[PDB]
Amino acid sequence: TPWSGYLDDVSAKFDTGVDNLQTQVTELSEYNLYRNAQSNTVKVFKDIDAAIIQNFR
Amino acid sequence: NLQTQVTEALDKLAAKPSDPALLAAYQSKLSEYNLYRNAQSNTVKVFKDIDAAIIQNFR
Amino acid sequence: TPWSGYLDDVSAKFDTGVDNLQTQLSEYNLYRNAQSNTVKVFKDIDAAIIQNFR
Amino acid sequence: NLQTQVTEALDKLAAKPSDPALLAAYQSKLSEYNLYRNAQSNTVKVFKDIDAAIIQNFR
Amino acid sequence: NLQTQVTEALDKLAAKPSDPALLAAYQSKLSEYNLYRNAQSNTVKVFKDIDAAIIQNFR
Amino acid sequence: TPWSGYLDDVSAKFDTGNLYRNAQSNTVKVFKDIDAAIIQNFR
Amino acid sequence: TPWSGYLDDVSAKFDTGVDNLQTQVTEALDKLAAKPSDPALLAAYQSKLSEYNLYRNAQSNTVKVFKDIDAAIIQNFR
Amino acid sequence: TPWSGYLDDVSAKFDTGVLSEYNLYRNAQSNTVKVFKDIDAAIIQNFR
Amino acid sequence: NLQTQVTEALDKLAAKPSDPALLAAYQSKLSEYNLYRNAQSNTVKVFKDIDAAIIQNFR
Amino acid sequence: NLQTQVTEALDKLAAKPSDPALLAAYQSKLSEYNLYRNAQSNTVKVFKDIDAAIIQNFR
Amino acid sequence: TPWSGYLDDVSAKFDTGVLSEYNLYRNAQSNTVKVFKDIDAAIIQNFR
Amino acid sequence: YLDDVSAKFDTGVDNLQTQVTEALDKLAAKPSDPALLAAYQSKLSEYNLYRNAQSNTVKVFKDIDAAIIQNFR
Amino acid sequence: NDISLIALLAFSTLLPFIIASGTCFVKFSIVFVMVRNALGLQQIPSNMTLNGVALLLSMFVMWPIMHDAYVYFEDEDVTFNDISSLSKHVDEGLDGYRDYLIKYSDRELVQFFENAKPSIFALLPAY
Amino acid sequence: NDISLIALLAFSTLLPFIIASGTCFVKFSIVFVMVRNALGLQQIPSNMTLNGVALLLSMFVMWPIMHDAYVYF
Amino acid sequence: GQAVNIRSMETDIVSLDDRLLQAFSGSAIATAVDKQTITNRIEDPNLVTDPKELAISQEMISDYNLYVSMVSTLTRKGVGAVETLLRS
Amino acid sequence: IGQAVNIRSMETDIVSLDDRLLQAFSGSAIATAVDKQTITNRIEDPNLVTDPKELAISQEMISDYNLYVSMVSTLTRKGVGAVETLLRS
Amino acid sequence: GQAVNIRDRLLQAFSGSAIATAVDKQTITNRIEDPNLVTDPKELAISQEMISDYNLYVSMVSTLTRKGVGAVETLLRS
Amino acid sequence: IGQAVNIRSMETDIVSLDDRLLQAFSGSAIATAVDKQTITNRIEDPNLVTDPKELAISQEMISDYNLYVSMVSTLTRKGVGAVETLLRS
Amino acid sequence: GQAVNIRSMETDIVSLDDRLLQAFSGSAIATAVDKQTITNRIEDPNLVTDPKELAISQEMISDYNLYVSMVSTLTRKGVGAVETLLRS
Amino acid sequence: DPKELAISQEMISDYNLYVSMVSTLTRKGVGAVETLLRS
Amino acid sequence: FYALYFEIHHLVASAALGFARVAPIFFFLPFLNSGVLSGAPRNAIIILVALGVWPHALNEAPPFLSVAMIPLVLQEAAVGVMLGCLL
Amino acid sequence: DGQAIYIYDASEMRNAVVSLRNVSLNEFNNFLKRSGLYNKNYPLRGDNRKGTFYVSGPPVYVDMVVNAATMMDKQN
Amino acid sequence: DGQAIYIYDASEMRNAVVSLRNVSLNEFNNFLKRSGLYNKNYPLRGDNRKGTFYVSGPPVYVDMVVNAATMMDKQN
């Protein structure tokens, strides 16, 4: 099956939340900060669970 | 029920990733959920450790 | 309930402290720089106690 | 079968290491596999440790 | 009573976020409360761990 | 063989599209940090 | 044999995904440094260095993410 | 009684020193306290 | 014989400590040697500990 | 006694925050005190750790 | 006597070595001391 | 051994520590030449790579020996 | 899975008392020293040895019922989704031992004890 | 200086086998088992307490010898 | 969809050993399913991402671990009491 | 958020040592049940865990809860260990 | 190209468990002397299992031998 | 900076044994009680925590308290174990 | 320069104690002057601003750290070897 | 040093196991003579 | 500094065979048996007596190394019970 | 079930209640009548066009209806 | 319940209270009346157009009302 996790759901929300922002920059600070906070938030979601997998044992 | 109001603020920033007031409130939300989750993770761990300490002492 | 907490209070303190700064550029730049700074401070000073629990 | 779609997304980024959507999806893949591998390591480890504790008790 | 004059300097910068002397005094306040809080957190921890070490020794 | 990147492609849209040298020299440093900070968020 | 590992796999996977960036930035360094005022040459090498900096940091931080998981296994050996 | 600390004192060396004279005045004053702030964060980590 | 081909790559970076390709390959060498050395140290350790457990059981 | 000649160069820059030679010497003082202070903190820590390790071994 | 380390000696090499001349003389000066700063700030984290 | 992994960087370059000193002797001699600023930035930036690639390899070799010694017990 | 290992380890711990009481070893080691007291010798042939010759004999005859315990329990057909059939499964595993105790114990004493097909826990002192 | 603590803890671990051999506890323990055996009593007076009463006299004599070691060291 | 089974089955016991044996089967069936349902939660890689279902899978380990550790040491004491009285 | 304290610690006579121990057990199980439900209601209210001042308070209630039950565990362990050596003799 | 080939009970038990611990010792020995297999994570995980069941095997036959010879002394002293 | 020292140690011959141990116990309990206050009021005083001159001293005293009480713990444990190995037999 | 004595002839000893006492006095004076010779290196300011002297003192810190723990576990194992014989 | 400490890492541990093995056999060795003399 | 650990480590191996030689004299003698001597200080005596009488030099390596060890113990016990029945 | 005759005793009857999302009860009953597994003695109790229902019978009939309902609703 | 007759003694009756969010009691009583699981001896006690009610009966009737009531709010 084509599999997607919750981290991918977060990154996909920046793809489905925009309508034509992926097309109209080809067709700039908007694309600067929209990709900035996307990586910063997926970094936070990368980190928040990683303390819990260590707290397993 | 914290995850509901987590899951209700990301989509309006997804539809408008240029509103300055919204990302300030969204960051104020998501760091607060960051403070909640590891607090629950650290607090169940001591309750495991002290319950394991009794059988390690009495074994 | 819609729960609000202390970081929501300190982030709204930047907005509700001024009257109409959100509706009326160098002022709003440093005003964001201090608003974004103080939440980086406040997310660290508690998280040191979070790792300092166990 | 996660390692298959791990080993299939690095090569298109290898051919094009400047696409902004692709390396964002690649990091969203690879950090998630990072979250998967130590989770499997930590979960087999406890199943070893509690099984070693029984022979430690009964020896 | 440190938290009082912590909670007393944020409101004048909130009402007037452009005075250069005030944000200098506000940053000079908040970093000192930053130095105080983790000092208290680090100092209770040693008193817990060394108290746990005695029962770890005598068990 | 002529290898291409997509930072080679955005130069190719600038060729095939003194202010031209000021628009391109800034947008090439837009990618130079956006795609550098994304891979710096690995660790 | 000159032996290769999995970390040499992923690093040379970047080096086979790219083809000529180790010498094409030298040819644009040949070009722009000859006459250092041409607008079609300033952006030429400035378009070569940008992909060289992104590609070299991409081949670097991947190494650390593929390191620390294998550190976590060997830490979980005992 | 308002308590004073050392970061107040080093900023009290700076505040009594007095338009480009006033805006290069907040230039170095931002630098000195931000560089003085991290010198003890390592040591205060270094109790444990 | 891994330490030989470790010790043959340090000298060209010593003569040229500014080549970007060489330090990338050197880090690709040295982190893999880091993964090799503690693996051998941790694996001899279990073969000692389980050998000590038999005489601990039978003493 | 380094902190004395730290505390003696800031006041003349306070009286003249536009002399270019003074902030060069002041930064050369204050960064050097930065290099001294973390050196003392880092050097007492190992002397604590190796002294704690022996009792950790012998307990 | 004032105690002069190596970074005091390199600032003494800038001072004792002697508008657009004098400003760029500081422009090269304010960065070289931060360069000498962080190189010894790289050894110091590697003690622990 | 640990002196030799340090000394391979002092042997691998001939006299770079003196080459930077004579360079900044020329910089304090005549601080107004563009080829002298560019030569100084090309000679100064090689040093921070040199000493941080001196201190990081001994840092990673330190914990490797620390992993060896602690697995005695 | 982990309940099977604690149950086998509990059998290895209890094994001296089961062979001391439950099996036919008591018929051997009693009547061996009965001959020594019949002859009148006190320390000849030094009953540490005579317990050995009583143990190899009692183990030689108990071992075939013990071999039945393997071939019933080392198989892979133990997965029963309902817990009562698995309970009756391990009831039928010990059925050869229970049948042996029934063969060698008196009838009415067992039903007096389980007055408190019969339980293995009740016939054990009656054997 | 640090390994003086190693010499102290290593002396500390081997302590009761020195009390098992070096001191005069060996005179009290033997004669107290002998006064139990000569009376014909086997188990009583429960020699776990007879080790204690034989130990307390030996400590009562050995204390001035061992006390000068602390003030000297 | 979901599905629960409302009817629980029961059987009569007459002796004392079967009361132990139904605890033996109830613990072997408890540990055999709880060794598996957290591994199926780990092997499904959508379940290893969300912190909500990470925190419930965090506490299911501690529920399994304290239970099997409790039944180990109670049985160690239970056979220790048969050990000492017969050694005397 | 508005509190109350009770000031009477009553005294009932013990009729035996067994009558004493039942009070000492019931007096300690209430304190260990209440403090753990205090720290849970502190956590489950999320506005208490986001403030800096209340966190060192919850740190203190954690470290006291760990030290209390560990001190009664090792003491009861050495107590029954003191019983076992005398009974072995 | 990869290839594949296809093919007193105490006196057979001790001989059966004799090389059963030897080949599992050696297969993780040349697993760890081969440096390609210790760098890959999913080869590290199956070696982590291969260590752990190795530990449970020789500890199980250790303690079960100990209680096996532990049942003879009490009956023999009687 | 205020210091004080007493120089002549009290010393005599007591054939009594327990009171020397009582003086050793009280001398250790008071010296470990005065310093837990001295480090605590150094840490709650907000002037001392900000000064880098005072901070170098503050890291020292927490190590001197740490190594001291851990030394008495390990010496006593070997001490009470040494009497255990002779009396348990 | 440095010195090496060439002939380490086995001076036969009446017991092993004089050898242990000379090894203990041979190394207590060693580590006592090391604990000074790196601390005074830190305490002089001219020694610590030079990176060249600084990584030398980093080196001697890594030697002094690795040394005492190599003597520590070696004697803890020696005591652990002798007590398992003497316990019996 | 990574190869020299590793070969001394085995060299300490195997000789420590050998000295414990030779001492446990001496204890069961003379203890078997003790019980056979009590017979 | 490896030989300092090896000198005590060759000794503790040499005393085990020294224990196996002189242990069944402490069972035979009337003023040294287990009826007259306790359990706790017995095994301290039997080790250091054989350490004071062991014939080879202590710092040297013992020649015991993997020759034939289980029958060597039955040699030293058989000569020990011989010396017991003569003494 | 068209192939064999299973016989249980009366104290082994188990029951369950399931909930379907995107498949109706009348369509599942038209599947059971299409296949032949429809049993008029132990029918399905629920509303005729809704999503939740109740089933009770022998343990081979209940585990069949549950395993085909939660694998048919996931496919649609 | 339409297929079997269950019998328990009087000391086994269970109680339960359950609050529905997006369905009424009069809409749930139609699910019990139309499907045939209605029982006039142990009805549902509550207000007719609300969410909260009270049940008490045999342990197979109580577990069916709770499990079939909390499975409708996930569908509506």
mmCIF file of N, CA and C in Angstrom, chain D residues 25-58:
data_model
loop_
_atom_site.group_PDB
_atom_site.id
_atom_site.type_symbol
_atom_site.label_atom_id
_atom_site.label_comp_id
_atom_site.label_asym_id
_atom_site.label_seq_id
_atom_site.Cartn_x
_atom_site.Cartn_y
_atom_site.Cartn_z
ATOM 1 N N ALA D 25 9.994 16.594 0.935
ATOM 2 C CA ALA D 25 9.381 15.278 1.065
ATOM 3 C C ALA D 25 10.409 14.221 1.431
ATOM 4 N N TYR D 26 11.661 14.419 1.036
ATOM 5 C CA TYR D 26 12.694 13.448 1.352
ATOM 6 C C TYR D 26 13.051 13.497 2.829
ATOM 7 N N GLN D 27 13.181 14.699 3.391
ATOM 8 C CA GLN D 27 13.368 14.841 4.832
ATOM 9 C C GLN D 27 12.163 14.335 5.617
ATOM 10 N N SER D 28 10.950 14.563 5.097
ATOM 11 C CA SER D 28 9.748 14.011 5.719
ATOM 12 C C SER D 28 9.701 12.490 5.651
ATOM 13 N N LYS D 29 10.354 11.900 4.660
ATOM 14 C CA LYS D 29 10.530 10.454 4.639
ATOM 15 C C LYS D 29 11.624 9.999 5.599
ATOM 16 N N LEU D 30 12.805 10.599 5.491
ATOM 17 C CA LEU D 30 13.989 10.038 6.122
ATOM 18 C C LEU D 30 13.991 10.258 7.625
ATOM 19 N N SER D 31 13.453 11.390 8.095
ATOM 20 C CA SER D 31 13.314 11.549 9.535
ATOM 21 C C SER D 31 12.267 10.602 10.090
ATOM 22 N N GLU D 32 11.300 10.218 9.273
ATOM 23 C CA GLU D 32 10.297 9.295 9.757
ATOM 24 C C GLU D 32 10.866 7.882 9.827
ATOM 25 N N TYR D 33 11.781 7.543 8.914
ATOM 26 C CA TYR D 33 12.484 6.271 9.061
ATOM 27 C C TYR D 33 13.467 6.303 10.224
ATOM 28 N N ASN D 34 13.966 7.501 10.560
ATOM 29 C CA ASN D 34 14.803 7.663 11.745
ATOM 30 C C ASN D 34 13.976 7.383 12.987
ATOM 31 N N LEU D 35 12.727 7.852 12.990
ATOM 32 C CA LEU D 35 11.824 7.579 14.098
ATOM 33 C C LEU D 35 11.422 6.113 14.141
ATOM 34 N N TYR D 36 11.515 5.408 13.015
ATOM 35 C CA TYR D 36 11.086 4.015 13.000
ATOM 36 C C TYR D 36 12.178 3.086 13.520
ATOM 37 N N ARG D 37 13.442 3.385 13.208
ATOM 38 C CA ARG D 37 14.492 2.397 13.463
ATOM 39 C C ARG D 37 14.830 2.296 14.944
ATOM 40 N N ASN D 38 14.936 3.429 15.637
ATOM 41 C CA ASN D 38 15.242 3.335 17.056
ATOM 42 C C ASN D 38 14.030 2.879 17.845
ATOM 43 N N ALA D 39 12.825 3.078 17.303
ATOM 44 C CA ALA D 39 11.629 2.535 17.933
ATOM 45 C C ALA D 39 11.660 1.015 17.904
ATOM 46 N N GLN D 40 12.098 0.443 16.775
ATOM 47 C CA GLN D 40 12.219 -1.010 16.708
ATOM 48 C C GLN D 40 13.345 -1.511 17.598
ATOM 49 N N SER D 41 14.401 -0.708 17.733
ATOM 50 C CA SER D 41 15.522 -1.107 18.574
ATOM 51 C C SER D 41 15.133 -1.064 20.041
ATOM 52 N N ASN D 42 14.349 -0.064 20.433
ATOM 53 C CA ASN D 42 13.954 0.047 21.822
ATOM 54 C C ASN D 42 12.890 -0.971 22.163
ATOM 55 N N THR D 43 12.127 -1.433 21.173
ATOM 56 C CA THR D 43 11.046 -2.330 21.527
ATOM 57 C C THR D 43 11.518 -3.769 21.599
ATOM 58 N N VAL D 44 12.528 -4.147 20.807
ATOM 59 C CA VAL D 44 13.051 -5.501 20.979
ATOM 60 C C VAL D 44 13.891 -5.592 22.254
ATOM 61 N N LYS D 45 14.456 -4.459 22.683
ATOM 62 C CA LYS D 45 15.382 -4.439 23.807
ATOM 63 C C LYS D 45 14.682 -4.762 25.120
ATOM 64 N N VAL D 46 13.482 -4.219 25.323
ATOM 65 C CA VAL D 46 12.722 -4.519 26.533
ATOM 66 C C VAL D 46 12.288 -5.985 26.558
ATOM 67 N N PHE D 47 11.955 -6.555 25.394
ATOM 68 C CA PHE D 47 11.564 -7.960 25.325
ATOM 69 C C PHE D 47 12.746 -8.872 25.601
ATOM 70 N N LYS D 48 13.954 -8.380 25.355
ATOM 71 C CA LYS D 48 15.127 -9.095 25.837
ATOM 72 C C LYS D 48 15.348 -8.903 27.334
ATOM 73 N N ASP D 49 15.172 -7.682 27.842
ATOM 74 C CA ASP D 49 15.545 -7.384 29.226
ATOM 75 C C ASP D 49 14.628 -8.069 30.232
ATOM 76 N N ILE D 50 13.316 -8.076 29.975
ATOM 77 C CA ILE D 50 12.426 -8.744 30.919
ATOM 78 C C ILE D 50 12.569 -10.252 30.804
ATOM 79 N N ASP D 51 13.019 -10.749 29.657
ATOM 80 C CA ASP D 51 13.249 -12.179 29.559
ATOM 81 C C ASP D 51 14.545 -12.564 30.255
ATOM 82 N N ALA D 52 15.515 -11.651 30.301
ATOM 83 C CA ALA D 52 16.734 -11.907 31.052
ATOM 84 C C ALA D 52 16.513 -11.762 32.548
ATOM 85 N N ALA D 53 15.459 -11.047 32.938
ATOM 86 C CA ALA D 53 15.231 -10.825 34.358
ATOM 87 C C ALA D 53 14.686 -12.084 35.014
ATOM 88 N N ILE D 54 13.991 -12.930 34.251
ATOM 89 C CA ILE D 54 13.425 -14.152 34.812
ATOM 90 C C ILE D 54 14.531 -15.141 35.160
ATOM 91 N N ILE D 55 15.490 -15.336 34.252
ATOM 92 C CA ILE D 55 16.621 -16.197 34.575
ATOM 93 C C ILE D 55 17.513 -15.562 35.623
ATOM 94 N N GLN D 56 17.534 -14.230 35.704
ATOM 95 C CA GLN D 56 18.231 -13.585 36.816
ATOM 96 C C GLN D 56 17.523 -13.830 38.142
ATOM 97 N N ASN D 57 16.206 -14.008 38.116
ATOM 98 C CA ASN D 57 15.498 -14.235 39.365
ATOM 99 C C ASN D 57 15.615 -15.693 39.782
ATOM 100 N N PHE D 58 15.535 -16.594 38.815
ATOM 101 C CA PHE D 58 15.436 -18.017 39.082
ATOM 102 C C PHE D 58 16.779 -18.717 39.162
#
